[PDB]
């Protein structure tokens, strides 16, 4: 759980 | 073998429009969010917005909106940062950073030094 | 939301452990990175999630919160250690850095 990063992919 | 490479520092009228590049080396570009940041002479890091080139989306800060428009070009593995309406206070260096899956393989480029002068 | 980072300058010997630390406005979570900026201007993450390490960033360096207040610590400064250092959050649009520490070495 961040927001910078990417979740899917 | 993979990093951020960002264009060469340029000097823009006022009043017109530039476009930043990044392009990203040893890796697909969509399997990250391209984020960019803003920073003024002697001033600190501010952030403008992030793109998910995969399908284009991008968040932006309020007082970037107006003027910042994020895009990417997946085949040519490059994102872009477009100012429109350049004055003095765009001058500023903007960095693109890194925001990958594996958090632990973010990194950053060295900076685009943009100076917007008459 | 606004993060308030303290001190705004810092004054250090070698050897010597320092702290710096950022008052989270609003709540922000385990969402919260530190980055350095070395004098050349290249940036490099230090710390991610609040207190996890990235690569290669040696073992002086440590994260940790404590209520609405997240700090970066060095247990013995060096010489390399010169720069200026920001607190990033990334929970709430529009992300936030602090105001950031030049963190100056007495010598």
């Known amino acids: 759980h961040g927001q910078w990063n990417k979740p899917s992919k | 073998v993979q990093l951020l490479e960002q264009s060469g520092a340029e000097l823009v009228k006022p009043g017109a429009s530039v476009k930043l590049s990044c392009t990203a080396s040893?890796?697909?570009?969509?399997?990250?969010?391209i984020h960019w940041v803003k920073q003024r002479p002697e001033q600190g890091l501010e952030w403008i917005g992030r793109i998910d080139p995969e399908d284009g989306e991008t968040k932006y800060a309020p007082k970037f909106q107006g003027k910042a428009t994020i895009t990417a070009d997946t085949s040519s593995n490059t994102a872009y940062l477009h100012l429109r309406r350049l004055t003095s206070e765009d001058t500023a260096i903007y960095y693109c950073?890194?925001?990958?899956?594996?958090?632990?393989?973010?990194?950053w480029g060295q900076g685009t030094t943009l100076t917007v002068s008459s | 939301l606004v993060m308030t980072q303290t001190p705004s300058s810092l004054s250090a010997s070698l050897g010597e452990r320092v702290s710096l630390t950022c008052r989270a406005s609003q709540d922000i979570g385990n969402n919260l990175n530190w980055i350095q900026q070395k004098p050349d201007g290249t940036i490099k993450r230090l710390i991610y999630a609040t207190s996890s390490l990235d690569s290669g960033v040696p073992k002086r360096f440590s994260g940790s919160r404590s209520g609405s207040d997240y700090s970066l610590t060095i247990s013995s400064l060096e010489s390399e250690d010169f720069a200026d250092y920001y607190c990033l959050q990334h929970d709430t649009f529009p992300l936030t850095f602090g105001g950031g520490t030049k963190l100056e070495i007495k010598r």
């Open positions: 040893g890796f697909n570009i969509e399997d990250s969010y």
């Open positions: 950073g890194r925001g990958a899956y594996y958090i632990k393989e973010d990194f």
